[PDB]
Design a protein around this ligand. Structure first.
Ligand SMILES: [Mg+2]
Ligand SMILES: [Mg+2]
Ligand SMILES: [Mg+2]
Ligand SMILES: [Mg+2]
Ligand SMILES: [Mg+2]
Ligand SMILES: [Mg+2]
Ligand SMILES: [Mg+2]
Ligand SMILES: [Mg+2]
Ligand SMILES: [Mg+2]
Ligand SMILES: [Mg+2]
Ligand SMILES: [Mg+2]
Ligand SMILES: [Mg+2]
Ligand SMILES: [Mg+2]
Ligand SMILES: [Mg+2]
Ligand SMILES: [Mg+2]
Ligand SMILES: [Mg+2]
Ligand SMILES: [Mg+2]
Ligand SMILES: [Mg+2]
Ligand SMILES: [Mg+2]
Ligand SMILES: [Mg+2]
Ligand SMILES: [Mg+2]
Ligand SMILES: [Mg+2]
Ligand SMILES: [Mg+2]
Ligand SMILES: [Mg+2]
Ligand SMILES: [Mg+2]
Ligand SMILES: [Mg+2]
Lengths: 257, 77, 138, 328, 539, 132, 194, 101, 49
RNA sequence: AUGACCCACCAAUCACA
RNA sequence: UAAUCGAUAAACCCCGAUAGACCUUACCAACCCUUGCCAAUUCAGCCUAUAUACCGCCAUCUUCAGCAAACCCUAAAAAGGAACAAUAGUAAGCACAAUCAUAGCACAUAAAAACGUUAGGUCAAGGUGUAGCUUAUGGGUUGGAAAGAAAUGGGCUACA
């Protein structure tokens, strides 16, 4: 029965069932989750519950300038050691069950409004820590493939700006959400506009534009009247540095347009 | 190397006549036992001791049943 | 620079007995991969030329053993996997050797046998005649 | 990656010294040829793929060629075609076209001076000259190429060579020449042999399909054939096989003039007839003229027959024949 | 013995020790497991049947039967006595061999229990002397009570059983080792038991004359003359003198070698006859021979006889001729101590690379020797090498032998080729102590001077900066030296900084210092900054 | 699709040893044998014994040196002695390495009743042939 | 605390005698071998893997202990053990005229815990009949007696001995068999006249 | 633990069959012989059919040694076809390789 | 002998020399199973109760 | 000629003090 | 029938089996045994359920040529990205290709063939998630497993 056994990697790979056909077509629900815990995490070479102490492993090779002999711990000493290890496991379970807080953008389950933090340094060493990025719209998008059938890409639409009058937006698309985030950041920094700000809070004059089927209408406010706008426009404004504004959008509210 | 096999020599292997001394000389028992003998004569995997133990098991088993042999239609020693 | 002094202590004795003569001594090396047998051949020949042992070397035909198993755990009998084991040979044929020389050359050679190879030693030794046959007649 | 190459050469030289020492040879007269034998003996890997076996070689042969640095420390690219993305190839095209124009000018001046003094060097065909392959060119520019690229270039060289050839022009187009090696299919005649006061006997060895045949033919004899110590009418009862044995002799009209002994092993009857056929044919090439040798080859007398039994395959029946396939 | 990979190769002497000791602790752990659960290791495969790989049986093979369990549990010490007690409880008679074995066990294992066990040895069984006296005269040397042993020598001589060789050995040693104010009364009793042994038909062994020498060692430093006589005595009867004999000879001959150098010549000639021969180191005490045979050459500084001791070592069996690793490193410490100063650099550099990394690793004593060897022969080439080697083996000693190493950097004169060696060697050093290490101003004399012979001022400036940043200063000849190195290339601002930091720290040459910056600022025509300096010092 | 002893292509980040990057059909062509012994040759005996021995050695070694084993073991058998040769990550202090060397060699020597040698080659991190 | 020591290849003298380094059969530590050797299959741009950490070189039986210098030395040390071959015996003719009897004996070496090979028992006895003192009658009677063990073209008599545990036992039994064949070939009996 | 109860059964069987080999042989000598009378042979018959039923060799099965599989075994390695392939395909079986020809 | 292999490597695990990830996996799974409340019934208890 | 219904993408880690 | 299981369009049907009289063996019927293979363990043990939780091995499209990271472009992008007298694409990687094998080439054959598709096949190779049994769905012994109304697949031998 000793030969009958296996490697940890094999056993976990087995138990998790990540590679099955259930995971691929989304043949099972996302609320069902199980994880892999290293079973060597807290163990030391030489340690056993029989309680031995080996000269090279558990205990230092020389004590008081001489060679320590093979010896065994007392019953109660082993009791305490196992108590320690159990409390270590419980500590790691206490660490694992705590979920880190996600700052909520617009709504709790929306990615909209959320910050991605500064885009990544360009190849020349050029660095923007002055820029912030906000997510405007994340969307699961599909395409019908010859082999796989439905094929799910995320595409995100993002905006960056330094608050000093340069902002720009871009869109990015990938199989993985993380990947599209990266892509749209790094791409956004390439299309920047300069937005002229009157006295560095409002716009200069009233604006009305019909872009495709969307009508935006903005009005220039005095100093105290903060940011009364569609939530996306407020996000973008905060990125530009426009602090006082009024805008009503009519017709299609489609985000990219 | 390591195995001399009790310092025996090939004549304590090939020729087993010595242990057939006590056995009926003209009977079918000579036939049978000369076959067993000849078999052991060709057997590499066994020691001298073991062959002799086979021989003796037969001595003892035939001498165990005298009755069936006498009744058999041949008087056998 | 640093040389140990007087480093040699061989122990050899000569018994009065007529050391055994070997008419021919054949050594067959089986191995899996050729190259190792070639290196071994080189080494063996070299070792014999230095002892003045006068040898020949030839190559016996290679044996390939094949067999089949099922490719699947359960049922597709139509699909198989075939495995090989190739055994390659060298033959070192030595002639006109003595007993001692044989024991040395064989000791040296056998120690240095690489791990993936096997060896078979066929010694044909010379004996004049037995005693009881010489020229008595019963 | 330049420091790498330098170091690698240092340690290849140090190493070559070491190796030459253990192998007990003179470090100066050590060649690559010797390095190889030395490793092959020291690290004997049987592996069928020769590229996977142990190698100690000069790092220039081991490592692939590197595009050198393309610009100075200020950022200006050295070569004026840099921004094309292929400098190497388009330079070649540039200079080639330049030489073409040059040729046109010079030859036009010589047209106005009433001189055509040049010749057509465009036939190298006896040298067996060909163009570089795409692979070769790609190695000469240290740059990847496209099929249409290679095509373009070659077409241009053609345009060049089709005009009056200058000296520097001839030399130019001849970097792009290679010579295809020897093409002759003429056989290698067995030297005729004279043995023990006996004159004119030749040897040949046929192999067909598990049958091997060694045939010795005597020119000095009358017509008969002894196969494995018996008469050929006895050993080959079947007409067809006797006709096979007859083929080469009847072809050369030697049918009464030669006396042959044979050793044939393995295979069946027809395979042995085939074997002796081939061997006999190969033996009679010593006695005949060089032209009739070409004839025998063109009759298919001198070629071994490659056709051999195929291996049965698992899951089939006969090496081709498949198990019966049920649709439903 | 050690694993051959670079990671597991021992760097120092301490690492060699801990590594080898570790390996043995592992081997032990294994053997423990085997002998704890033998049934797992029972199943045999090997055809020639190695008996050596079989598990061992430390249990008694019979329980209640006395005559088995006694000897069984004796071969195994306390279970032996539990056994002899369970045999004496059943009224089973214990014979002359029984507690001769239990006695040899009381001598080999094991002050009240010795008296009790001895009392049971004599009272119950009337043991033949040749066993009982053997054990008790051996064990009461260990329990330190030799008198009752002379009483047992009387009781043994009474019964016609002669005292065997080890008796006269142990009692020659007992009458020797016991001396109260009077040595002659002892030595005479010794020569009397030595004559009494010759009369009793017992032939004195080589180890009896050897024991006698060992005894004559510990009392008089001039007791080498009787011992010398003994050294001739054995040579008359045909027994070849042991390396232990010769050792003790070299011990008293050394104690009398320090004031008088003639006994030295006698050790050297005794050794000179000893060394034309191939050894068979078969006696018990022999290590200290090759310890002290070479030890004398280190104090007397005589290299030829050390070449001879080495030719002796490498001859019979080199490996078998030195017992311990400490007593082994003494050998090379002293021997290479001789090789370094006494011989040409051609010889020293040679034996260096052979002995140092390969056999046994450099101590502090062999460290200082290489330093003094390169100062006299003027070798500046081998400094980076010996430093890099001394880094690997010599980590702990570093701080203490550091101040000496660098001192050989001042003594030289430095050409343009050697600049980079100084730069690297010193830079690694000070980068090691500025990242953690009290740092000498000597080291700055060196970086700054070697960088003046290098032609590099800019780094010597930053290094002087890094010492005045260490919250203490060099003496003023170094500050005047870099005042000069910054003056020759016309760098007066760095000179201003240096003499400002100099006048802040009180430096003794301050008259001469102020005079040197006034001179350099009169040479570069910085004079207004010199007057501003006088105005900054007056305030 | 044959799956046997294969390491499938991931997104292209996956580190793969020289061994793992070669499917069984490359044995004796590109990669070589992880064991060597006489048993599988034409006229030879006790193949089965050596196979079981092998399996136990891989398992044993994998458990005795947890986490520090780089690539699969190499087992050379020569004239009754087995030299085990391993690639080991540097994890443990050389104390633990020598302890385990000695412990192992003795233990296995007494188990299999033949002299066992152990040869450790030490490596900074898993040698990487491909992807990564 | 992480320790990395440079390889032995650094401290290696160019002319250092190699057999010093690898006296016995050795695993090939890359650290202790000076020669750069790349083995392994390459990758499309790349080269064969380095000698450090290379598992494939570890698999190779290495002839490094056997480098020809080391052999020359080894053999020259072995010249003392070997004994000379008698002059006159140089040709096979004289071999037979002097020694009639050839005894073939096999010895097998395979790696593993046990030495024991079943095939080792077999002893073969080859003897020319022309080297025997046989009468005409005795020769015919022996030929008929042994049968298949006699080759009529080459006149070489063959005795294959198996049946006993040891090769020495089998040697004795083959010799004995030969003896008895010769003694019982010369005895004429009653039925031989029939 | 043997991997399966079945394997256990088999181990026992091989033990018993080893133990009684001598008896079985000695008796089947009598049984298989034409020379002896039938009256001895019928008694000898009941004799060998008296012996424990798990002592007779035909009741033995060669099983995969690691995995206990009752068939699909290759006698030489005493291995199941599946386990054999699993070892050979990682190249842990010396001198075994895929076969092309 | 599978008993010797299983027994010996079990002990060597308890003496902390050998490390069995398979047995560890089995363990941790089982622990988490007794925690969730489905364990192995003490002998005799399960059916009738 | 015909071929219940139902099938799919809305959750985040590891490591150290 | 008291009396296994698994495969069961292509991609099952001399298939798991390169192998069942007892054994094998999982089934049926009687009987037995309950810390019950192991160093220890309120534990061993389970051919119990789920192949629609899986690893391992595979089948299949397939001798099909595509898959895929990192980028770049598009009066917006769901997605698309070639034109060689070239119009927006570069791309490492894996497949194909090349090499290796079948003892010389060549050809052939073998081998190889990615990503995915069929919740394809297999918890009875072994291992395992989840859920189940524990004086029984576990472990042993003895003996039984029949059979041909009919339908059919693949073979063998034939009809000369
Ligand atoms: Mg919410
Ligand atoms: Mg057919
Ligand atoms: Mg099971
Ligand atoms: Mg069977
Ligand atoms: Mg309908
Ligand atoms: Mg429908
Ligand atoms: Mg089922
Ligand atoms: Mg079904
Ligand atoms: Mg289907
Ligand atoms: Mg049945
Ligand atoms: Mg049954
Ligand atoms: Mg069941
Ligand atoms: Mg499925
Ligand atoms: Mg493609
Ligand atoms: Mg569009
Ligand atoms: Mg695209
Ligand atoms: Mg690509
Ligand atoms: Mg080929
Ligand atoms: Mg092809
Ligand atoms: Mg195929
Ligand atoms: Mg291919
Ligand atoms: Mg299904
Ligand atoms: Mg199914
Ligand atoms: Mg199961
Ligand atoms: Mg039918
Ligand atoms: Mg079929």
């Amino acid at each position: 029965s000793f030969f009958t056994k296996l490697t940890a990697d094999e056993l976990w790979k087995g138990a998790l069932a990540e590679s099955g056909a259930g995971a691929r077509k989304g043949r099972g629900k996302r609320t069902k989750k199980k994880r892999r815990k290293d079973l060597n995490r807290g163990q030391i070479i030489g340690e056993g519950r029989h309680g031995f102490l080996w000269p090279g492993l558990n205990i230092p090779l020389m004590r008081n300038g001489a060679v320590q002999t093979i010896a065994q711990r007392s019953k109660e000493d082993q009791e305490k050691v196992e108590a320690d290890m159990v409390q270590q496991r419980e500590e790691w379970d206490r660490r694992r069950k705590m979920k880190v807080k996600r700052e909520r953008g617009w709504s709790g389950n929306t990615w909209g409004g959320v910050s991605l933090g500064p885009p990544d340094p360009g190849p020349n060493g050029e660095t923007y820590d002055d820029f912030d990025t906000r997510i405007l719209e994340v969307r699961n998008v599909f395409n019908m493939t010859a082999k796989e059938g439905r094929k799910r890409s995320v595409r995100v639409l993002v905006a960056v700006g330094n608050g000093k009058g340069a902002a720009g937006f871009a869109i990015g698309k990938a199989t993985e959400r993380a990947d599209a985030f990266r892509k749209a950041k790094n791409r956004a920094v390439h299309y920047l506009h300069y937005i002229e700000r009157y006295e560095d809070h409002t716009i200069y004059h009233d604006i009305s534009l019909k872009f495709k089927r969307t009508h935006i209408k903005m009005k220039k406010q005095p100093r105290g009247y903060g940011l009364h706008c569609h939530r996306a426009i407020m996000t973008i404004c905060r990125l530009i540095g426009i602090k006082d504004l009024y805008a009503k959008v009519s017709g299609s509210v489609n985000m990219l347009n | 190397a390591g195995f001399d096999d009790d310092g025996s020599e090939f004549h304590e292997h090939i020729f087993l006549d010595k242990y057939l001394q006590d056995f009926p000389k003209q009977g079918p028992i000579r036939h049978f036992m000369e076959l067993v003998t000849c078999g052991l004569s060709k057997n590499p995997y066994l020691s001298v001791k073991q062959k002799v133990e086979h021989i003796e098991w037969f001595r003892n088993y035939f001498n165990e049943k005298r009755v069936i042999l006498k009744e058999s239609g041949i008087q056998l020693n | 620079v640093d040389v140990p002094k007087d480093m040699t202590k061989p122990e050899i004795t000569i018994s009065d007995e007529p050391d055994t003569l070997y008419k021919r001594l054949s050594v067959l090396v089986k191995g899996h991969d050729k190259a190792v047998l070639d290196s071994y051949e080189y080494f063996a020949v070299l070792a014999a030329k230095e002892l003045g042992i006068s040898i020949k070397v030839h190559e016996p035909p290679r044996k390939i053993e094949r067999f089949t198993l099922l490719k699947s755990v359960h049922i597709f009998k139509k699909h198989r996997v075939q495995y090989e084991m190739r055994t390659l040979y060298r033959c070192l044929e030595l002639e006109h050797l003595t007993g001692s020389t044989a024991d040395v050359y064989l000791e040296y050679i056998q120690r240095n046998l690489p791990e993936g190879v096997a060896m078979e030693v066929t010694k044909t030794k010379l004996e004049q005649l037995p005693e009881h046959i010489r020229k008595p007649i019963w | 990656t330049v420091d790498f190459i330098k170091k690698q050469i240092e340690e290849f030289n140090i190493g070559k010294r070491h190796l030459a020492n253990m192998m007990g040879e003179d470090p100066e007269t050590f060649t690559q040829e010797d390095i190889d034998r030395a490793i092959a003996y020291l690290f004997p890997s049987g592996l069928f793929e020769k590229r996977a076996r142990p190698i100690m070689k000069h790092p220039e042969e081991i490592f692939p060629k590197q595009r050198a640095i393309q610009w100075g420390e200020d950022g200006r690219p050295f070569h004026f075609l840099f921004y094309t993305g292929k400098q190497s190839y388009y330079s070649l095209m540039h200079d080639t076209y330049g030489k073409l124009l040059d040729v046109e000018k010079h030859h036009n001046q010589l047209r106005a001076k009433d001189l055509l003094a040049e010749k057509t060097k465009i036939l190298k065909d006896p040298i067996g000259s060909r163009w570089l392959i795409k692979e070769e060119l790609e190695e000469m520019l240290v740059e990847k190429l496209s099929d249409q690229d290679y095509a373009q270039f070659i077409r241009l060289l053609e345009r060049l060579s089709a005009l009056p050839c200058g000296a520097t022009e001839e030399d130019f187009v001849n970097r792009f020449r290679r010579s295809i090696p020897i093409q002759s299919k003429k056989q290698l005649i067995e030297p005729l042999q004279y043995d023990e006061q006996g004159m004119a006997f030749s040897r040949g060895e046929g192999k067909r399909k598990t049958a091997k045949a060694e045939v010795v033919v005597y020119g000095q004899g009358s017509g008969r054939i002894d196969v494995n110590g018996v008469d050929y009418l006895l050993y080959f009862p079947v007409t067809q096989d006797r006709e096979q044995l007859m083929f080469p002799l009847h072809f050369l009209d030697r049918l009464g003039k030669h006396d042959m002994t044979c050793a044939v092993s393995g295979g069946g009857r027809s395979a042995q007839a085939g074997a002796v056929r081939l061997a006999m044919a190969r033996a009679l090439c010593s006695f005949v003229t060089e032209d009739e040798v070409e004839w025998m080859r063109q009759a298919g007398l001198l070629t071994a027959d490659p056709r051999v039994r195929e291996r049965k395959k698992p899951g089939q029946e006969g090496a081709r024949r498949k198990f019966t396939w049920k649709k439903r | 013995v050690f694993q051959d990979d670079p990671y597991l190769i021992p760097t120092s002497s301490v690492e060699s020790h801990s590594f080898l000791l570790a390996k043995k602790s592992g081997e032990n752990a294994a053997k423990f497991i085997i002998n704890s659960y033998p049934k797992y290791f029972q199943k045999d495969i090997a055809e020639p049947h190695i008996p050596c790989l079989m598990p061992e049986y430390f249990e008694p093979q019979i329980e209640d039967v006395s005559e088995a369990a006694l000897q069984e549990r004796i071969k195994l010490x306390x279970x032996x006595x539990x056994x002899x007690x369970x045999x004496x409880x059943x009224x089973x008679x214990x014979x002359x061999x029984x507690x001769x074995x239990x006695x040899x066990x009381x001598x080999x294992x094991x002050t009240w229990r010795t008296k009790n066990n001895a009392e049971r040895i004599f009272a119950l069984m009337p043991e033949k002397n040749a066993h009982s006296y053997c054990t008790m005269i051996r064990g009461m040397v260990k329990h330190q009570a030799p008198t009752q042993a002379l009483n047992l020598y009387t009781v043994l001589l009474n019964n016609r059983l002669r005292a065997d060789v080890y008796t006269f050995n142990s009692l020659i040693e007992a009458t020797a080792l016991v001396v109260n104010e009077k040595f002659e009364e002892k030595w005479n009793n010794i020569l009397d038991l030595l004559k009494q042994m010759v009369t009793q038909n017992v032939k004195p062994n080589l180890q009896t004359f050897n024991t006698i020498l060992k005894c004559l060692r510990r009392f008089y430093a001039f007791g080498k003359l009787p011992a010398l006589q003994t050294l001739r005595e054995m040579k008359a009867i045909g027994i070849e003198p042991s390396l232990a004999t010769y050792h003790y000879v070299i011990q008293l001959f050394y104690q009398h070698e320090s004031p008088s150098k003639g006994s030295s010549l006698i050790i050297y000639d005794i050794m000179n006859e000893v060394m034309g021969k191939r050894f068979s180191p078969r006696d018990p005490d022999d290590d200290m021979f090759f310890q002290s045979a070479m030890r004398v050459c280190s104090s007397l500084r005589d290299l030829e006889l050390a070449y001879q001791v080495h030719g002796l070592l490498n001859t019979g069996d080199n490996w078998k001729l030195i017992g311990s690793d400490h007593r082994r490193n003494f050998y090379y410490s002293k021997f290479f101590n001789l090789l370094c100063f006494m011989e040409q650099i051609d010889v020293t550099l040679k034996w260096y690379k052979d002995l140092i990394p390969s056999v046994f690793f450099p101590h502090s004593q062999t460290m200082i020797d290489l330093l003094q060897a390169l100062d006299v022969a003027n070798r500046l080439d081998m400094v980076p090498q010996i430093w890099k080697d001394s880094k690997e083996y010599g980590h702990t000693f570093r701080n203490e032998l550091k101040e000496e190493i660098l001192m050989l950097m001042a003594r030289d004169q430095h050409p343009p080729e050697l600049q980079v060696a100084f730069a690297d060697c010193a830079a690694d050093i000070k980068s090691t102590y500025e990242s953690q290490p009290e740092w000498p101003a000597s080291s700055l004399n060196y970086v700054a001077v070697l960088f003046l012979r290098a032609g590099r001022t800019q780094e010597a400036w930053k290094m002087l900066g890094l010492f005045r940043k260490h919250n203490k200063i060099p003496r003023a000849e170094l500050l005047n030296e870099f005042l000069d190195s910054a003056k020759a290339s016309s760098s007066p601002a760095q000179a201003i900084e240096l003499v400002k930091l100099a006048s802040a720290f009180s430096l003794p040459v301050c008259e001469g210092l102020t005079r040197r910056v006034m001179a350099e600022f009169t040479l570069t025509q910085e004079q207004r900054e010199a007057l501003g300096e006088l105005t900054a010092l007056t305030s | 699709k044959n799956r046997a002893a294969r390491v499938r292509v991931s997104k292209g980040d996956k580190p793969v040893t020289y061994e793992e990057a070669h499917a069984p059909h490359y044995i004796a062509h590109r990669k070589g044998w992880l064991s060597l012994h006489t048993g599988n040759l034409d006229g030879e005996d006790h193949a089965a014994e050596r196979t079981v021995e092998d399996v136990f050695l891989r398992k044993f070694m994998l458990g005795t040196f947890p986490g520090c084993l780089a690539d699969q073991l190499v087992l050379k058998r020569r004239a009754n002695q087995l030299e085990i040769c391993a690639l080991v990550l540097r994890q443990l202090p050389p104390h633990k390495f020598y302890f385990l060397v000695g412990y192992s060699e003795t233990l296995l020597s007494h188990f299999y009743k033949c002299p066992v040698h152990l040869h450790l080659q030490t490596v900074p991190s898993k040698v990487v042939y491909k992807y990564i | 605390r992480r320790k990395a020591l440079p390889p032995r290849t650094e401290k290696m003298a160019v002319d250092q005698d190699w057999p010093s380094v690898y006296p016995v059969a050795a695993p090939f530590k890359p650290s202790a071998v000076p020669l750069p050797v790349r083995m392994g299959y390459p990758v499309k741009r790349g080269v064969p893997m380095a000698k450090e950490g290379n598992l494939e070189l570890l698999k190779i039986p290495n002839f490094l202990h056997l480098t020809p210098v080391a052999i020359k030395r080894h053999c020259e040390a072995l010249k003392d053990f070997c004994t000379e071959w008698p002059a006159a015996l140089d040709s096979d003719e004289k071999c037979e005229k002097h020694f009639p009897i050839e005894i073939d004996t096999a010895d097998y070496v395979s790696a593993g815990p046990s030495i024991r090979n079943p095939k080792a028992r077999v002893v073969t006895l080859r003897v020319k009949l022309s080297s025997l003192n046989l009468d005409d009658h005795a020769k015919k009677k022996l030929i008929k007696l042994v049968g298949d063990r006699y080759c009529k073209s080459t006149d070489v008599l063959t005795i294959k001995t198996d049946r006993c545990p040891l090769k020495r036992q089998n040697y004795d039994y083959a010799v004995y068999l030969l003896t008895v064949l010769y003694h019982e070939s010369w005895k004429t009996e009653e039925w031989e006249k029939k | 633990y043997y991997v399966d109860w079945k394997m256990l059964r088999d181990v026992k069987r091989r033990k018993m069959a080893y133990e009684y080999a001598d008896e079985r042989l000695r008796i089947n000598s009598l049984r298989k012989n034409t020379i002896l009378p039938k009256d001895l042979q019928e008694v000898a018959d009941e004799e060998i059919a008296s012996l424990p039923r798990d002592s007779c060799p035909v009741r033995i099965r060669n099983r995969c040694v690691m995995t206990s599989r009752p068939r699909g075994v290759k006698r030489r390695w005493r291995l199941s076809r599946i386990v054999f392939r699993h070892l050979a395909d990682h190249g842990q079986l010396s001198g075994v390789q895929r076969a092309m020809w | 002998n599978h008993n010797t292999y299983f027994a010996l490597m079990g002990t060597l695990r308890f003496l902390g020399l050998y490390r069995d990830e398979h047995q560890d996996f089995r363990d941790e799974q089982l622990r988490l199973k007794k925690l969730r409340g489905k364990g192995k019934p003490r002998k005799g208890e399960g059916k009738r109760a």
